[PDB]
Amino acid sequence: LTYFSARKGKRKTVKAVIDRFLRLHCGLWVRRKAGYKKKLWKKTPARKKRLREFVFCNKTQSKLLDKMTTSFWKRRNWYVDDPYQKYHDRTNLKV
Amino acid sequence: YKTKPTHGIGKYKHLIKANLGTDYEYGVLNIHLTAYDMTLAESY
Amino acid sequence: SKSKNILVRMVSEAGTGFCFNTKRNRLREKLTLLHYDPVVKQRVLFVEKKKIRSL
Amino acid sequence: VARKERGWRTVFPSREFWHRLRVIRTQHHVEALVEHQNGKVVVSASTREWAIKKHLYSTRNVVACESIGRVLAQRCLEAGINFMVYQPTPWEAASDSMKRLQSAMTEGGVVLREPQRIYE
Amino acid sequence: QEERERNNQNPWTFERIATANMLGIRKVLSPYDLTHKGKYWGKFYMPKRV
Amino acid sequence: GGKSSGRRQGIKKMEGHYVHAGNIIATQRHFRWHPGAHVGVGKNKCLYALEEGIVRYTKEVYVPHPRNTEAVDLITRLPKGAVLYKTFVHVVPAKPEGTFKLVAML
Amino acid sequence: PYMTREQERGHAAVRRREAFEAIKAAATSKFPPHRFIADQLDHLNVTKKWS
Amino acid sequence: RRTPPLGPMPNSDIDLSNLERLEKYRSFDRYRRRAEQEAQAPHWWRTYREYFGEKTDPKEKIDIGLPPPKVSRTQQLLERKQAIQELRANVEEERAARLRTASVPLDAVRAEWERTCGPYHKQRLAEYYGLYRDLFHGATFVPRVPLHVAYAVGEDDLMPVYCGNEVTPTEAAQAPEVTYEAEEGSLWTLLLTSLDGHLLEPDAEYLHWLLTNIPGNRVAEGQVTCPYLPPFPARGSGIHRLAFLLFKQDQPIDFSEDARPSPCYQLAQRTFRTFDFYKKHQETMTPAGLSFFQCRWDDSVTYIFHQLLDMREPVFEFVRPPPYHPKQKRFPHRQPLRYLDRYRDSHEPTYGIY
Amino acid sequence: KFTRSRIPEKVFQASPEDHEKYGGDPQNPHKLHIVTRIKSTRRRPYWEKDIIKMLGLEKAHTPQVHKNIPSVNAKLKVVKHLIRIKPLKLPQGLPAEENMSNTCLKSTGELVVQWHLKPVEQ
RNA sequence: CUGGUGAUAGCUGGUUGUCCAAGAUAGAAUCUUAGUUCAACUUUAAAUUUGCCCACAGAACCCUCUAAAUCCCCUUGUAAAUUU
RNA sequence: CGAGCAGUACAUGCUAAGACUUCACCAGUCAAAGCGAACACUCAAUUGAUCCAAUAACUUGACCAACGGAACAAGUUA
Ligand SMILES: [Mg+2]
Ligand SMILES: [Mg+2]
Ligand SMILES: [Mg+2]
Ligand SMILES: [Mg+2]
Ligand SMILES: [Mg+2]
Ligand SMILES: [Mg+2]
Ligand SMILES: [Mg+2]
Ligand SMILES: [Mg+2]
């Protein structure tokens, strides 16, 4: 990670995180399952069902990905007809 | 469970499993039934 | 590690384009299965078209 | 909507029912019972009672078994029990006397398969 | 040996202390000592131990 | 030289524990605990609660299914009068299926 | 023992429950202290001098 | 550590010395019959019956019915034996029995069934419905006197009420035809109560019909203590059960306190408790007959609430408990995207301050 | 392996010869204990250290009063080798509201309600 | 020799006032075992309500039998525990 | 002492409560209800991430066996 760039002097973003993960504005990170396109002929339908689904990262992984991306990726966006629009805010969450 | 009073309640192996002829009982007897009729030997 | 079986692709005869991969013996004629097609929501005939890989 | 006692997968018979038709055929008598899941017996029909014994040449033949079902089917309708399960062994199912007992219950208006529980 | 145990004037015995865990003695004892009652130490037997 | 680790299989919910529908009760290599009332069994002999309630462990008479040849061949060779017992785990439901509530006065 | 297991049961439930509520009250009453305007002004006395 | 058993072991009586010369089961049915016998016996360990079996009081339940009839077994047995030999003597019956073509007349079988063992089956069936549990708080009685109750539907058909059969309120709109065997000079008391028909008090019951001091079988000549009221089970309230009670009176009784005006369309007066009513009349009255049926809601119930009862019809609905979800956590690890939908109330988009 | 110790129930059963040596009465058991720690929790298992804290016996040679009930006795039977147990004696009875400031626990286990610090005139 | 160059070093050595407080031994992966990452443990802040101790009851048959015990755990003694 | 399979299916379809988890993560496992059909396959292990490549899509590709895998590199020094 480049904490200070050589031309602007500002923190850079690791593009390997942007192409793999999605950040909900609430703070959650959404990823894919490792191996959902590999060797599907030898996997049971139950196994493939939980492979082609989107999951959330844990506390440590979410903290790691926040340090590897700048504030441009943590802002609130208002994309028109966004599939994940309703997931950007938590509901009835305590502590 | 071993410490419980009901230990070993499920045991079944001793129920199922767990020649020499003595002077009082004959060891093995072979009974031969010779007859010209096949049905008579099978029936007897 | 001799390849007894091969992986083949069954293409639906309903024209919907739905296809699935199944494993069949190498020394065997082309399969013609009766598999469920989600597009027409019923079981339709399928035909082997191309061998994918040798298992 | 009442829950059935699901489970007991490794043992026989099952308990996922509300009412069960249990047929007891002894050396001399033949008895059929309709009992609830909790063990309580709803209605009964046996060859030991004088009502059915006085009209049977033999209480241990197929005719006696078929006659019990015809008598029990009338009692099932009166009792309000219309659905019940039958859980025979593979040899009992293949037997001729149980086949006609099932026919008597079906012709009497009793269905030998309970409707599925409603969960939603 | 049975006579010695009965007429022993010592009020303290290995069996009583070991079983009741008096003084926390089980911390330096062994699980086998609960049955050996102090008469055995390794491969050696002590006939004089009551 | 083969290296392996424990499978962490055993009792997940003990006697008297409150469970919900779908909670796994026990994972077994072989049928150490048999499914009882309102207890299902998975592919890997995994016991899960089919209803929400209290888990109970009891000893019940083991009557195998007639189709199971190995188990039927075992009871037929038992001495007359012998009865097999095995440990069954049951879930005693705590809540009713539902209640009738007034919704309108028409 | 003075009492058996059955007699002892529930003989101290009220006091134990009340004792824990004190722990809950003390734990859930944690808050920053009050800030007084008198304390801010009392620092001006450091330059207090005679005439 | 080991603990000795608190009772005899299941297979303790079996001797292992001569295991080879011991009779086996050799069959699944022989083991199953023996297996069920021990499953119904008490055990010192935990069992299925302990947790799921219906708890009952160790005290024996009392019997408050008529005394059993006195029948000479020796004469009864001899007459039954003689009929069997005559039936088996005929060669036509044996030929029909061997050909599996003979059959019994079902109408004649029930005629003998209702006289010999019919009352005992009714008591067992009534206990299953828990009528004795609610009406008499567990007190039981044998319905020695059969009761025939049927509703006149149209002009040619009848709807009999035997024990718990389904009857619609439209068919039960009028007073049923009540017939039963009785001797002259005897006094009877008919009673119809709806245990589940009550709308406010679960324990209390609604009264539908009450006739007292009926001379013999002439039900019409009996006093009309309470006018007949059709069952009114609320819509969506399930299945209600109404019980017909036939009482035998030893001396004439005055039911002025239990009398109700004609008509009686007030549910406060229609409230009726069989346990308390029988408690003060048990000295001069003993139950003799029993009949009941199951009732659902139909269109005729709407007429009862609006026109007869002069009220709005209550509508019930079977409500299930809300689905259980664990406490929501800030970071749900390895949870699908649909995790957030489980804890979301509104399905429509939200915008907050914007 | 060293594990927790299960004391047999037979040990805690007073014999007839014990009542004539300690002066206890099985028919009238004492209501309260006087537990005093006389041994260090150091070099003892952690579960024995925890029970000492639960009984309020952090400081040694500091008498503490506990109720003679099975649940409390259960904890005492675990650390019975680290404590001294004596019954609480009340020759003058329970302290009153006017005697709270005049009580004194003697080494004999008696809790007197009149502590005058004056020689007996008798 | 100068410059890149303050090359790099998972290695060695060093790391400068006072006082108080909490505070030690499960593991996994790794061109890895002189290292690092995660977990566990530890610290601080916050929030919440149970935490520990534990009465019965309960936890498998086998290859024939056999240990100290452990898990679970209301009371009770206690004041912690969980979560952010 | 084994495993790097094979066999039977072709709804071995689609969806979805609650949980297990090889002490982390990755990965792995079970599953009621529901739609749609019929009237969560056997098997202790029987397996390989990302990038990339091929393809209209579907999907497939490593004794990457040094099996959490570097796209491709030996010997020797007295
Ligand atoms: Mg340097
Ligand atoms: Mg290193
Ligand atoms: Mg310190
Ligand atoms: Mg884990
Ligand atoms: Mg490597
Ligand atoms: Mg490796
Ligand atoms: Mg690994
Ligand atoms: Mg040289």
From Swiss-Prot, chain A:
One of its GO terms (biological process) is translation. It is found in: Mitochondrion. The keyword Transferase does not apply. GO terms for cellular component: mitochondrial inner membrane; mitochondrial large ribosomal subunit; mitochondrial ribosome; mitochondrion. Transmembrane segments: none annotated. Keywords: Mitochondrion, Ribonucleoprotein, Ribosomal protein, Transit peptide. GO terms for molecular function: structural constituent of ribosome. It comes from the Eukaryota. Belongs to the bacterial ribosomal protein bL35 family. Component of the mitochondrial large ribosomal subunit (mt-LSU). Mature mammalian 55S mitochondrial ribosomes consist of a small (28S) and a large (39S) subunit. The 28S small subunit contains a 12S ribosomal RNA (12S mt-rRNA) and 30 different proteins. The 39S large subunit contains a 16S rRNA (16S mt-rRNA), a copy of mitochondrial valine transfer RNA (mt-tRNA(Val)), which plays an integral structural role, and 52 different proteins. This is Large ribosomal subunit protein bL35m. It comes from Homo sapiens (Human).
Curated annotation (Swiss-Prot), chain E:
It is found in: Mitochondrion. Transmembrane segments: none annotated. It comes from the Eukaryota. Component of the mitochondrial large ribosomal subunit (mt-LSU). Mature mammalian 55S mitochondrial ribosomes consist of a small (28S) and a large (39S) subunit. The 28S small subunit contains a 12S ribosomal RNA (12S mt-rRNA) and 30 different proteins. The 39S large subunit contains a 16S rRNA (16S mt-rRNA), a copy of mitochondrial valine transfer RNA (mt-tRNA(Val)), which plays an integral structural role, and 52 different proteins. The gene is MRPL16. Belongs to the universal ribosomal protein uL16 family. Disulfide bonds: none annotated. This is Large ribosomal subunit protein uL16m.
Curated annotation (Swiss-Prot), chain H:
The keyword Coiled coil applies. It comes from the Eukaryota. Residues 73-101 form a coiled coil. Keywords: Coiled coil, Mitochondrion, Ribonucleoprotein, Ribosomal protein, Transit peptide. InterPro entries: PEBP, PEBP-like_sf, PEBP_euk. SUPFAM superfamilies: PEBP-like. It is found in: Mitochondrion. It holds the Pfam family PBP. One of its GO terms (cellular component) is mitochondrial inner membrane. GO terms for biological process: mitochondrial translation. Component of the mitochondrial large ribosomal subunit (mt-LSU). Mature mammalian 55S mitochondrial ribosomes consist of a small (28S) and a large (39S) subunit. The 28S small subunit contains a 12S ribosomal RNA (12S mt-rRNA) and 30 different proteins. The 39S large subunit contains a 16S rRNA (16S mt-rRNA), a copy of mitochondrial valine transfer RNA (mt-tRNA(Val)), which plays an integral structural role, and 52 different proteins. mL38 is located at the central protuberance. Belongs to the phosphatidylethanolamine-binding protein family. Mitochondrion-specific ribosomal protein mL38 subfamily. This is Large ribosomal subunit protein mL38. It comes from Homo sapiens (Human). The gene is MRPL38.
Swiss-Prot record, chain I:
One of its GO terms (biological process) is mitochondrial translation. It comes from the Eukaryota. Keywords: Mitochondrion, Ribonucleoprotein, Ribosomal protein, Transit peptide. Its main location: mitochondrion. It is found in: Mitochondrion. GO terms for molecular function: structural constituent of ribosome. Component of the mitochondrial large ribosomal subunit (mt-LSU). Mature mammalian 55S mitochondrial ribosomes consist of a small (28S) and a large (39S) subunit. The 28S small subunit contains a 12S ribosomal RNA (12S mt-rRNA) and 30 different proteins. The 39S large subunit contains a 16S rRNA (16S mt-rRNA), a copy of mitochondrial valine transfer RNA (mt-tRNA(Val)), which plays an integral structural role, and 52 different proteins. Belongs to the universal ribosomal protein uL30 family. This is Large ribosomal subunit protein uL30m. The chain holds residues 35 to 156 of 161 of the full protein.
